[PDB]
Amino acid sequence: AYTNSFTRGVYYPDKVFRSSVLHSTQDLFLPFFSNVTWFHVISGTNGTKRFDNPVLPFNDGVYFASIEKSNIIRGWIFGTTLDSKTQSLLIVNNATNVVIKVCEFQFCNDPFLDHKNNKSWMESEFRVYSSANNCTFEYVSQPFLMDLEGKQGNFKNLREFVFKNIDGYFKIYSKHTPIIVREPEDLPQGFSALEPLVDLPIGINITRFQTLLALHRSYLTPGDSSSGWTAGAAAYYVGYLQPRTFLLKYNENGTITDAVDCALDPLSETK
Amino acid sequence: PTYGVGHQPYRVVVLSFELLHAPATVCGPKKSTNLVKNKCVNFNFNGLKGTGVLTESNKKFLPFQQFGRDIADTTDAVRDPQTLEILDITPCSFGGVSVITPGTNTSNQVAVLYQGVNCTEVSNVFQTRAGCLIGAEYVNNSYECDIPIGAGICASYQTQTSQSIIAY
Amino acid sequence: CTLKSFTVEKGIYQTSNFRVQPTESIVRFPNITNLCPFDEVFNATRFAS
């Protein structure tokens, strides 16, 4: 399946304060009106569906934006040759802490995390770990990226992610918003910038990408409605990046209002 | 224990400093000074450098930005590293100097005019719209313009009835 | 010396460039912290062979 991205994927530039100016820069942004590959697990509930396990290649960036009320996706592990010689990169954000670790171990190919999302087990049993050989770096931080409230329940939560591989770093952007209950393939038309959170100084050369899905043990009331149990309401979107000039506008406080793709039509070039 | 100096055990720690092809991490420790405010001095922050007067501006920056640019792509706002306070920098004082001479054949008295100053960055002292005029007194009369100064201010070597350059 | 003569006529003549020079230097870096466990915990007496 495919969808249309009106105007999204515009992250914040370098940490430079600009107010009421029109600055243009060249970086790996997301072009407007682009085709986004939708490879979400169709169902599973009331009709077992095939677990979507897309080994999509990491091509100079990826645009991840999931619409979920409860946490259904945990890991965004990368890699190039995921059999014996590849340093893993776990971005699992459970309830306790983050599991950022680049230790060298046996790489597996399990689509789910372990099993048994019920309350009887822990938050995330690391059954994917076979045997460690030699570790290099582990960022076990307390603040986790997964920040789900789940107060009203009727309104979902859209949390975007922008992953880019720097020559000597690994920048990670994220941004959440209380998206209202809507039908699939109905992304809200509106500008929204992502705030920089962390910057891992890693020097690995990843080429492919393979995520994993895991349901949190904090099982709420049975969501018989469409905005309830999100076991079969995944929104796994993937968008590639490419170099393109963008014109950014700043407000009187330091926030970005909108942006111009600079290549859409002869009218945009004149602007 | 009852042995010679050739039996003493030596616990040796072998440092192997390594610098490969990846982000470096074991660097060296750094120091700091105090915060001299209101003085045109040099500042050397983590990444930015320069000189000027350090002040305090009422700006609200997002908690991830550290640098600051202006309309002309110039550094104008900074952030205190170990204090998290909004500091504002201003260029050091400067300007031009002009000399008013009524003629060597008449007298040798001259006057100076520092363009762009409020009579504060270094004798009759009078503030005008072009700078600080040092060496002339402002007369409340009105005559013809002889030496144009600026913004309607004119000067002429006149008598005070001793002669001096007067301003009007 | 600017006009290259010994007789100056009546008028105003722009000359020099007033300038205040910088003085001290202030260095500021973040609260040190993250002291590495660069010492084997008080060189624990327990050593291998």
From Swiss-Prot, chain B:
Subunit relationships: Binds to host ACE2. RBD also interacts with the N-linked glycan on 'Asn-90' of ACE2. Cleavage of S generates a polybasic C-terminal sequence on S1 that binds to host Neuropilin-1 (NRP1) and Neuropilin-2 (NRP2) receptors. Interacts with host integrin alpha-5/beta-1 (ITGA5:ITGB1) and with ACE2 in complex with integrin alpha-5/beta-1 (ITGA5:ITGB1). May interact via cytoplasmic c-terminus with M protein. May interact (via N-terminus) with host bilirubin and biliverdin, thereby preventing antibody binding to the SARS-CoV-2 spike NTD via an allosteric mechanism.
Effect on the protein of changing residue 156 to A: No effect on O-glycosylation by host GALNT1
Function description: Attaches the virion to the cell membrane by interacting with host receptor, initiating the infection. The major receptor is host ACE2. When S2/S2' has been cleaved, binding to the receptor triggers direct fusion at the cell membrane. When S2/S2' has not been cleaved, binding to the receptor results in internalization of the virus by endocytosis using host TFRC and GRM2 and leading to fusion of the virion membrane with the host endosomal membrane. Alternatively, may use NRP1/NRP2 and integrin as entry receptors.
Name the UniProt record assigns to this protein: Spike protein S1
Region annotation Disordered: where it falls in the sequence: 21-43
Effect of residue 72 to D: In strain: Alpha/B.1.1.7
Sites where a glycan is attached: 105, 118, 140, 159, 161
Cystine bridges: 40-92, 119-132, 145-154
Species of the source: Severe acute respiratory syndrome coronavirus 2 (2019-nCoV)
Highest taxon above the source species: Viruses
From Swiss-Prot, chain C:
Region (Disordered): 19-35
Effect annotated for changing residue 46 to K: In strain: Mu/B.1.621
Annotated glycosylation sites: 23, 25, 31, 43
Complex and partners: Binds to host ACE2. RBD also interacts with the N-linked glycan on 'Asn-90' of ACE2. Cleavage of S generates a polybasic C-terminal sequence on S1 that binds to host Neuropilin-1 (NRP1) and Neuropilin-2 (NRP2) receptors. Interacts with host integrin alpha-5/beta-1 (ITGA5:ITGB1) and with ACE2 in complex with integrin alpha-5/beta-1 (ITGA5:ITGB1). May interact via cytoplasmic c-terminus with M protein. May interact (via N-terminus) with host bilirubin and biliverdin, thereby preventing antibody binding to the SARS-CoV-2 spike NTD via an allosteric mechanism.
UniProt function note: Attaches the virion to the cell membrane by interacting with host receptor, initiating the infection. The major receptor is host ACE2. When S2/S2' has been cleaved, binding to the receptor triggers direct fusion at the cell membrane. When S2/S2' has not been cleaved, binding to the receptor results in internalization of the virus by endocytosis using host TFRC and GRM2 and leading to fusion of the virion membrane with the host endosomal membrane. Alternatively, may use NRP1/NRP2 and integrin as entry receptors.
Protein name: Spike protein S1
Species assigned in the record: Severe acute respiratory syndrome coronavirus 2
Lineage: Viruses, Riboviria, Orthornavirae, Pisuviricota, Pisoniviricetes
Boundaries of the shown chain within the full protein: 301 to 349 of 1273
